[PDB]
Amino acid sequence: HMVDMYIERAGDITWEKDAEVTTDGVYRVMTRGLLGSTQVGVGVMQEGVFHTMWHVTKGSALRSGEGRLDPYWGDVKQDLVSYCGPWKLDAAWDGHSEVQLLAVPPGERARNIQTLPGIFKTKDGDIGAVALDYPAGTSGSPILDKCGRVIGLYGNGVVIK
Ligand SMILES: Cc1ncnc(OCCN(C)C)c1-c1ccc(C[n+]2cc(NC(=O)Nc3cccc(C(F)(F)F)c3)on2)nc1
């Protein structure tokens, strides 16, 4: 198994008025190996805690340039994981206003996309999600709210409770 897996900084967490209608910031998750480097997912650094999705890393310890990051807390059913500390993204969607997906796909620059999320009624339960199709590897990119905070990630949605 290829042990090597690192992160690279794409940009910062900012709400943009104009849109399409170690240190804090977003990082793209990479895996260098035998052929080259490829993006597996995206994550969010905030309050000295790297947050991302479980299916990206799968409990794999990440490298932050020089220093190593081991995992701290995770959840497979929720599909979440935090490094160096507990989950510190308590904020969630208001349930009516529009939101901004800070999309960070492989081999292309980061950008904000303003959009109203749709509500879907899955056989398991009723969930809410953004109506934007992006490639796998973008999964783990943050969704921002009007007040600035992060309220979920790309890939999996959230249940209405
Ligand atoms: C679930 C579903 N069910 C049935 N059909 C489906 O698409 C059918 C069309 N398809 C054939 C292309 C979809 C669907 C629809 C869209 C997507 C794209 N996407 C969004 C996300 N992430 C995400 O939404 N995060 C999130 C977390 C918390 C809160 C919120 C918010 F507040 F913003 F709502 C969002 O991740 N991916 N993925 C699956």
Q: Which string of DSSP letters, residue by residue, matches 66-110? A: TEEE-EEEEETTTTEEEESS---------SSS-EEEEE--TTS--
Atom of ligand 1 nearest to the CA of 119: 34
Reported resolution, Å? 3.2
- Cα angle for residues 126, 129, 134 (degrees, 5° grid): 140
d(CA 36, CA 13): 28
User: Which of 143, 144, 161 for mutating ligand 1's site (highest number of atoms within 8 Å of CB)?
Assistant: 143
Nearest-CA residue for ligand 1 atom 7 is: 131
d(CA 104, CA 120): 24
Q: Name which of 80, 33, 85 is nearest 55 in CA terms.
A: 80
Token readout for 49 is 């805690």
Nearest-CA residue for ligand 1 atom 37 is: 155
Nearest-CA residue for ligand 1 atom 34 is: 129
CA of 4 to the centre of ligand 1 (A): 30
d(CA 44, CA 150): 9
Active-site residue list: 55, 79, 139
CA of 99 to the centre of ligand 1 (A): 13
Ligand 1 pocket, CB under 6 A: 93, 99, 117, 120, 128-133, 143, 151-152, 154-155, 157-158
**98 CB contacts (<8 Å, ≥6 apart)?**
114, 115, 116, 146
What are the C-alpha distances in Å from 108 to residues 24, 97, 153?
21, 28, 18
Decide: residue 106, CB within 10 A, 0-12 exposed, 13-18 middle, 19+ buried: middle
Contact 73, 87 (CB under 8 A): yes
